[PDB]
Amino acid sequence: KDMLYSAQDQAPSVEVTDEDTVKRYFAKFEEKFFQTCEKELAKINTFYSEKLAEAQRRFATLQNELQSSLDAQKESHEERVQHRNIKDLKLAFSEFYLSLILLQNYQNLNFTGFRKILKKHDKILETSRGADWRVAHVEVAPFYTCKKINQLISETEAVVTNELEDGDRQKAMKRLRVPPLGAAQPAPAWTTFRVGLFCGIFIVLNITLVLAAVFKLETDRSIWPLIRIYRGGFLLIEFLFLLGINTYGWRQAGVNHVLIFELNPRSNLSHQHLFEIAGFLGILWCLSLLACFFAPISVIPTYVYPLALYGFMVFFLINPTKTFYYKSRFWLLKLLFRVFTAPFHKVGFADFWLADQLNSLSVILMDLEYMICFYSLELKWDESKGLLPNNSEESGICHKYTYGVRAIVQCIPAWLRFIQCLRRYRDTKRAFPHLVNAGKYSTTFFMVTFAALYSTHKERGHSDTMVFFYLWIVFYIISSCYTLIWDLKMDWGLFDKNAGENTFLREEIVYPQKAYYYCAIIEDVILRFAWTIQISITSTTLLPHSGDIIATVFAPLEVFRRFVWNFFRLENEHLNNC
Amino acid sequence: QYEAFKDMLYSAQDQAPSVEVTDEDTVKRYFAKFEEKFFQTCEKELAKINTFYSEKLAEAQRRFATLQNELQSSLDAQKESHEERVQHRNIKDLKLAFSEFYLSLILLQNYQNLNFTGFRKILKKHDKILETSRGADWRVAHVEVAPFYTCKKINQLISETEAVVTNELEDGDRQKAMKRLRVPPLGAAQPAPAWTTFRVGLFCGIFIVLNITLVLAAVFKLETDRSIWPLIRIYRGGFLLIEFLFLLGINTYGWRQAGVNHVLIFELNPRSNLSHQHLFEIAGFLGILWCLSLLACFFAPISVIPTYVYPLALYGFMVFFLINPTKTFYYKSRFWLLKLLFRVFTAPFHKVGFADFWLADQLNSLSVILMDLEYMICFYSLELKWDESKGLLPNNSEESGICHKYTYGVRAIVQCIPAWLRFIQCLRRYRDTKRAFPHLVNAGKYSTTFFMVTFAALYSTHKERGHSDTMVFFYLWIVFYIISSCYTLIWDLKMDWGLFDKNAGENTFLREEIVYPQKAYYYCAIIEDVILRFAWTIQISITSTTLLPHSGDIIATVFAPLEVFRRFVWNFFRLENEHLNNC
């Protein structure tokens, strides 16, 4: 290690003084190596002596206890008491044996490391004194060679088994099977192989798809409904990948999230499996999309391909068997059932988190509405007309705002969150947080309803159309600026008035670099105000087909904002509470 | 004894009726019979246990005596850098033997303990059933006093031998002794980091998608106007090459499955080897490079450098990767392969090792690559005019056949390079050993290929001229085919795999001892070898059933990924037999 790199890179000057200086330097290096080896040997000997003394004391105590138990036996409440005493003595003996074995293993590992270091130094520096000294003194240590302690412990355990357990040798051996200790939690290699395979298939399919789209696909076709349908799956796969990154970060951070999540000591999930399912969903989505554009199979109508996709994903969750990781799917199903009712059931952090994530996941809620509209009152199912090359407003009455069919679905997550907030107020009997969150979420109601009001009144040309707009924009900030002040003060718990050596941040954190925290703050600030671009473009000339294109670009970003929000929210409550 | 006790208990339960079902006299007679049977079973179990313990003690004593004799021989050899390598091999073999003896002793002790525990449990169950107290006395008299469990001197002797080996030989190197005498060694990979397997999966997926998109593009997008066939001629070898690597990967997996020592026979560093996933990912890398090159040649998107850049660029990247002087991309293995090639081609000078002739045989079934290289050299150098675009030339021109005929006969010499090198190597081996029983016959077998190719070319060059007496030459050619083929089969069977041995025994059509789990593998491998080695014969069948001109050329390509298949299977048991003897 150090000898190969540092000593070789030292490169002392060949001609710096008389040869006496070079000889003295070589002698000093040899003496320093010898002194370091002697210090290591002395430390190893002291540790071995301490471990031997502790083991001897523990063995004496255990032998006294075993002799007393054997004398009492040789000479029912008494029988139960004796059994409990024997079990406790066996547990204490096992613990002492484990401690002594750990000490001996540590001493042996230290000796082996010292020998390896001495050998490496001798080989790199081309010296033979250190290796000879290690072989003569360190290598011949009787403490490591002496294994009679293990034999004595085995004899004591066998005597206890014979006198007390009456010949139960197999049970004693199984209970006291301790020698090559060591364990870990490595992920299966097959899982890694599968995730890499799916990642590669996804990458190659994505590039070939985009190449075909830019070259082979032509403009005159109608694309808007197609992307309108597929953005749902795109957001789903992005969200799955993003949660996988979340859970990997949490695991690497060492936050004991499992305790607050009261989950089974398996977490029911591992980031590799989330990456796997994300890759699988991406493969299905891309294959379906490419099939839709190409339509290779004869003259099959293209308005049937996406359906299976949607079916498939629900088909992945509604499998009644005990395959496809039957422990997480049932968990998510039962939690989602608990959420969508709300007042009837009690309050849980998982329900809160799921509602919070579904709040941002707006598009994946009215995308189904668009799908059902298009396939209900805009399709040609009875006949066989599967191209739809033209566009109009009447055919597409639902991609607009018009009725509340959009406002209600938009506010469904908002209504949920409002209701759990009120339930938390009722069962908690706490005023400030619930009462401020009620308005913090009802401002979304006000915003969306005022926007719908403008949308429906503009079609007629009423004067007050130019009045409500004034409210809408300000009704924007009353939401946005408010949400932000909720996000740092309590959600992330920043901007502490009792700031310390750190500026605008809590005095204690878990992540290494505070500049990451500052960048997270600035990116949250930038991302939350994304709707300004909408009015900026709709305060000038109206580009054709500019409506939904604004939604498309913001769609990944809205979910992307959720990423930074999870990390701090989980840790802020964790660190503040304890 | 546990199975007999369980069967006796089940029989007693079946013969046991309800309390009021049977009379008292019948119950008493059945109980007396059961007690006598239990006594007889206990006595027989004690006798069998004593016999088994005596046999185990005798086997342990024999193993200890063999280990002591081996240690004495090693000490005598040491008392009285090739010598260093021999000493290292002897030390490794002695360490392996000592570890095997210690593991066998531990397994015998564990088996004796398990047998005693099972006998005690059976006695307790019998006592519970029949309500008798003699079971405890029998267990005390037999289970506790078992000689195999009581004899722990094997462990002490093994420890003393290990300490003596560490002191006298290793000069106090206790770490090496502990590593060599450790219970676990081979088996669990050791698991590589997930990045390696992730790269393997990424590359294999990219390969599969490029393959499928390439075949779809070829079947659909291609326009049938140009003879694509010459193109295959300049790619086939690369294909074979990449396929070759893939197979060897699985090969090493087999080596890690049966547990046979293969790193030692290669004198490679025991602490550093090339795990299969690295070979797999190199295979994926070269395969995806080949696929993209083929696709680019197939579509030709950029019309400035039409066709000349693709194969040359592929092979240039190949050679640049192979001899990369940087300290990455598994540099150690690449320099090792370069040194091996240097040693094998410098055959008459340096000593012949295992890897030398292994890879000589490897290249023997790789000569298609050599033919491809000479053909592409001929095309690019002799008749091709560089100042051209694409190369869309109808085959109506008389200019063809310049590199298609044999002319000087260069095809035979490049074909027979492996034969000549193997001939020289085996003759040198004879010169080194002064024994000709297993060597000059190998020389003649390999020299048969000389007559093969020479007479094939002779009939080819005399076919167009007529000379109806050339049918004698045809008969000669086919009879050399027959003799070469049969000699190759008899060598591969009797010698290379040791099967068809006159000492067969109950293992019909096999040797006395095997390692690989199943025998069906051996049989199917035998039938596979015998079928595939006669591949050329199928070729002639086609010319006896078809009269289409230039038919044979297209036939060759399907035969190409077949000699790689025969060696892939042949390579497996080749190591197994060489495990026993030494070269």
Chain A interface disruption, residue of B174, B181, B271, B276, most A CBs within 10 A:
B174
Q: Do A194 and B201 touch (CB under 8 A)?
A: yes
Contact B149, B109 (CB under 8 A): yes
Nearest to A94 by CA among A83, A105, A86, A106: A86
Nearest partner of B565 among B254, B284, B245, B244, judged by Cα: B244
- Residue B15, Cα to own-chain centre: how many angstroms? 56
- Distance, in Å, from the CA atom of A215 to the CA atom of A145, rounded to the nearest integer, reads 75
Residue B514, classified by CB atoms within 10 Å of its CB into exposed (0-12), middle (13-18) or buried (19+), is: middle
Taking contacts as CB-CB distances below 8 angstroms, the residues of chain B near A185 are none
B374 contacts: CB under 8 Å, gap ≥ 6: B410, B411, B414
Residue keyed to tokens 């200086």 = A21
Neighbours of B79 (CB within 10 A): 6
Contact call for residues A462 and A468 (beta carbons, < 8 A): no
What distance in Å separates the CA atoms of residue A338 and residue A332, rounded to the nearest whole number?
Answer: 10
Strands (E), B62-194: none
Instruction: Report the distance separating Cα B462 and Cα B472, nearest Å.
Output: 12
For chain B, the residues before each gap (C–N > 2.5 Å) are 80
Q: Which residue's entry shows tokens 């690989």?
A: B516
CA distance A414 to A360: 10
Short-list B39, B41, B48, B46, CA closest to B7? B41
Contacts of B197 in chain A (CB under 8 A): 189, 192-193, 196
Give the mutation candidate from B152, B178, B197, B200 for the A interface (greatest A CB count, under 10 A).
Answer: B197
Residue owning tokens 């890879």: B359
Residue A169 marked ligand-binding: no
Residue A356 known to bind ligand: yes
Buried b (16+ CB within 10 A) or exposed e, A267-296: ebbbbbbbbbbbbbbbbbbbebbbbbbeee
Distances (CA, A) of A239 to A261, A288, B333, B446: 20, 19, 43, 64
Task: Print burial letters for B107-146: b (CB count within 10 Å at least 16), e (below 16).
Answer: ebbeebbebbbbbbbbbbebbebeeeeebeebbeebbeeb
Token pair 């007693």 is found at B12
Query: In this structure, how many other beta carbons lie within 10 angstroms of the beta carbon of residue B386?
Result: 6
Give the closest of A162, A173, A187 to B113, CB-based. A173
Neighbours of B88 (CB within 10 A): 14
Question: Quick one: tokens of A64?
Answer: 């006294």
Nearest CA among B571, B569, B574, B486 for reference residue B523: B569
**Do A220 and A389 form a contact (C-beta atoms < 8 A)?**
yes
Question: Residue B481 and residue A75: Cα distance in Å, rounded?
Answer: 93
Apex CA A402: angle with CA A342 and CA A354, to 5°? Answer: 25
Cis peptide bond prior to B87, omega within 30° of 0: no
- Tell me the C-alpha to C-alpha distance, in Å, between residue A344 and each of A340, A341, A419, B391, B526: 10, 6, 11, 78, 73
**Which positions in chain A touch B139 (Cβ < 8 Å)?**
167
| Interface membership of A311 toward B (CB under 8 Å) | no
Residue A246 among known ligand-binding residues? no
Which residues touch B187 (CB under 8 Å, ≥6 apart)? B256, B259
Q: Is A569 annotated as a binding residue?
A: no
Contact B473/B454 with Cβ under 8 angstroms?
Answer: no
Three-point CA angle A156, A158, A161, nearest 5°: 110
DSSP, collapsed to helix, strand or coil, labels residue B397 as coil
Per the CB < 8 A criterion, the answer to whether B148 and B53 are in contact is: yes
Nearest-angstrom CA–CA distance, B474 and B459: 7
How far apart are alpha carbons B122 and B139 in whole angstroms? 10
CA angle A404, A408, A409 (to 5 degrees): 115
Indicate the Cα dihedral angle A411, A412, A416, A421, nearest 10°. 0
Alpha-helical segments (H) within B133-228: 134-142, 147-150, 153-164, 174-180, 194-216
Cis-peptide, bond into residue B190, ω within 30° of zero = yes
Neighboring chain A residues of B113 at a CB cutoff of 8 Å: 169-170, 173
How far is B203 from B284, CA to CA, in rounded Å?
Answer: 5
Q: What angle do CA B64, B65, B67 make, to 5 degrees?
A: 65
How many Å lie between the alpha carbon of A472 and the closest alpha carbon of chain B?
A: 50
**Contact residues, chain B, for A147 at CB < 8 Å:** 159
Inter-chain touch B209–A200, beta carbons under 8 Å: yes
Please state, as a whole number, how many other Cβ atoms lie within 10 Å of the Cβ of residue A339.
19
Residue A218 neighbours by CB under 8 Å, 6+ apart: none
User: CA dist A543 to A534, A538, A550, A553, B567, Å?
Assistant: 12, 9, 12, 16, 68
Q: Is A134 annotated as a binding residue?
A: no
Query: What CA–CA distance (Å, rounded) separates B442 from B433?
Result: 15
Torsion of CA A530, A533, A539, A543, to 10 degrees: -130
The secondary structure of residue A134, as a DSSP letter, is I
Q: Which two tokens stand for residue B17?
A: 């009726």
Q: Tell me the C-alpha distance between B352 and B356, whole Å.
A: 6
Q: What is the DSSP letter of A303?
A: G
CA-closest candidate to residue B576, choices B268, B185, B245, B254: B254
Across the interface, whether the CB atoms of A197 and B202 are under 8 A apart is answered: yes
Question: Which residues, other chains included, contact B117 with Cβ-Cβ below 8 Å and sequence gap of 6+?
Answer: A169, A170, B143
Q: Which residue of A has its CA nearest to B160?
A: A145
What letter does residue A493 receive in the DSSP assignment?
-
Q: Helix, strand or coil for residue B259?
A: coil
Burial class (CB in 10 A: 0-12, 13-18, 19+), A34: middle
Amino acid occupying residue A436: V
Structure tokens at A556: 């990944």
Which of B202, B208, B271 is best to mutate for the A interface (most A CBs within 10 A)?
B202
Among residues A66, A145, A138, A147, the alpha carbon closest in space to that of A100 is found at A147
Q: In this structure, what are the phi and psi dihedrals at residue A139, rounded to the nearest 5 degrees?
A: -70, -25
Residue B406 forms contact with A (CB below 8 Å): no
Query: H/E/C letters for each residue in B555-579?
Result: HHHHHHHHHHHHHHHHHHHHHHHHC
**Which long-range CB contacts under 8 A does A317-325 form with residues at least 24 apart?**
A325/A273
Contact present, B211 and B199 (Cβ < 8 Å): no
> What 8-state DSSP symbol labels residue A178?
-
Structure tokens that stand for B364 in this block:
């023997």
If residue A27 lies in a helix (H) or strand (E), which one and from where to where?
helix A19-74
The interaxial angle of helices A349-360 and A326-339, nearest 10 deg, is 80
| Rounded Cα gap, residues B434 and B428, in angstroms | 10
**Are residues A44 and A141 in contact, defined by beta-carbon separation less than 8 angstroms?**
yes
> Could you give the count of Cα atoms lying within 13 Å of B54 in the half-sphere of its Cβ?
6
Residues of chain B numbered 85-124 and touching chain A (CB < 8 Å): 113-114, 116-117, 120-121
Long-range contacts of residues B131-134, Cβ cutoff 8 Å, at least 24 apart:
B132/B35
**DSSP per-residue letters across A106-123:** HHHHHHHHHHHHHHHHHH
Residue A180 to residues A147, B6, B184, Cα–Cα distance (Å): 15, 34, 10
Closest listed residue to residue B549, CA positions, set B439, B408, B395: B395
Q: What is the DSSP letter of B382?
A: I
- Whether the CA torsion B515, B518, B519, B521 is positive or negative: it is negative
Indicate the SS3 state at residue A17.
coil
d(Cα A228, Cα B97) in Å, to the nearest integer? 71
C-alpha A24/C-alpha B393 separation (Å) is 81
Cβ–Cβ < 8 Å for B214, B291: yes
φ, ψ of residue B330 to 5 degrees: the values are: 55, 65
The dihedral region occupied by B353, where left means phi > 0, alpha psi between -120 and 50, and beta the remainder, is beta
What is the distance between the alpha carbons of residues B141 and B125, in angstroms, rounded to a whole number?
Answer: 17
Percent helix, percent strand, percent coil in chain A, to nearest 5: 75, 0, 25
Alpha carbon distance B510, B503 (integer Å): 9
Please choose, from the candidates A103, A108, A125, the residue with its C-alpha nearest in 3D space to the C-alpha of residue A34. A125
Give whole-number Cα distances, A165 to A169, A189, A547, B123, in Å.
8, 43, 82, 16
Give me the amino acid identity at A543.
L
Distance CA B114, CA B18 (A): 35
Query: How remote is the C-alpha of B122 from its chain's centroid?
Result: 46
In one letter, which amino acid is B489? Answer: L
Q: What is the length of chain A?
A: 578
b/e sequence B402-420, b meaning 16+ C-beta within 10 Å: ebeeeeeeebbeebbebbe
SS (H, E, C) A296-353: CCCCCCHHHHHHHHHHHHHHHHCCCCCCCCHHHHHHHHHHHHHHCCCCCCCCCHHHHH
Q: Give the integer Cα–Cα distance in Å for A552 and A228.
A: 9
Q: How far apart are CA B259 and CA B273, in angstroms?
A: 15
Question: What does each C-alpha distance from B186 to B155, B180, B256, B259 come to in angstroms?
Answer: 23, 11, 7, 7
Cβ contacts of residue B411 below 8 Å, gap of 6+?
B371, B374, B457
CA gap B359, B345 in Å, rounded = 11
CB B91 within 8 A of CB B169: yes
Q: Do B197 and A189 touch (CB under 8 A)?
A: yes
Phi and psi angles of residue B579, each rounded to the nearest 5 degrees, phi first: -60, -30
| CA-based nearest residue in chain A for residue B139 | A167
Distances (CA, A) of A465 to A447, A468, A476, A541: 15, 6, 17, 19
Of B136, B174, B208, the CB nearest to A139: B174
Residue A152, Cβ density class (10 Å: 0-12 exposed, 13-18 middle, ≥19 buried): middle
The three-class DSSP label of residue A425 is helix
Q: Does A542 touch chain B (CB under 8 A)?
A: no
How many CA atoms within 13 Å lie on the side-chain side of A137?
Answer: 16
Q: Please list every residue in chain B whose beta carbon sits closer than 8 Å to the beta carbon of residue A204.
A: 205-206, 209-210
Tell me the C-alpha distance between B132 and B121, whole Å.
14
What is the least distance, in Å, from the CA of B518 to any CA of chain A? 26
* Cβ contacts of A537 within 8 Å, gap of 6 or more: A543, A546, A550
Is any Cβ of chain A less than 8 angstroms from the Cβ of B232?
A: no
Q: Which of A193, A149, A162, A2 is nearest to A73 (CA)?
A: A162
3-state secondary structure A141-170: CHHHHCCHHHHHHHHHHHHHHHHCCCCCHH
Token pair of A246 as six digits: 């979340």
Give Cβ neighbours of residue B262 (< 8 Å, ≥ 6 apart). B252, B255, B575
* CA nearest to B192 within chain A: A189
Longest CA pairwise span in chain B (Å): 114
Q: What is the full DSSP assignment across A382-410?
A: TTT--------SSTTTTTS--STTTHHHH
Chain B residues lying within 8 Å of A195, measured CB to CB: 198, 201
- Do residues B235 and B311 touch, judged by C-beta distance below 8 A? yes
Closest CA to A204 of A290, A121, A324, A333: A290
Chains A–B, number of C-beta pairs less than 8 Å apart: 89
List the beta strands (DSSP E) in A374-485: none
Shortest Cα distance, chain A CAs vs residue B44, angstroms:
22
Q: Which residues are CB-neighbours of B239 under 8 A, at least 6 positions away?
A: B290, B561
Q: How far apart are CA B247 and CA B314, in angstroms?
A: 22
The ranges assigned to domains in chain A are: 2-175
Q: Which two tokens stand for residue A532?
A: 């300004």
Count of Cβ atoms closer than 10 Å to residue A506 Cβ: 19
Annotated binding-site ranges of B:
361, 364, 445-446, 533, 566-567
Query: How many angstroms separate the CA of residue A139 from the nearest CA in chain B?
Result: 5
CB < 8 Å to B174, chain A: 112, 115, 139, 144-145
CA angle at B427 for the pair B424 and B428, rounded to the nearest 5°: 85
Per-residue DSSP letter, A345: S
A184: alpha, beta or left? (left if phi > 0; alpha if psi -120 to 50) = beta
Count the Cβ atoms, other than its own, within 10 Å of residue A549.
Answer: 12
- The answer to whether the CB atoms of A199 and B205 lie below 8 A apart is yes
Long-range contacts of B347-356 (CB under 8 A, 24+ apart): B347/B421, B347/B424, B347/B425, B347/B428, B348/B424, B348/B428, B351/B432, B352/B425, B352/B428, B352/B429, B352/B432, B353/B267, B354/B265, B354/B266, B354/B578, B354/B583, B355/B266, B356/B425
The DSSP element (H or E) to which A507 belongs, if any, is none
Q: Is A192 exposed, middle or buried (0-12, 13-18, 19+ CB in 10 A)?
A: buried
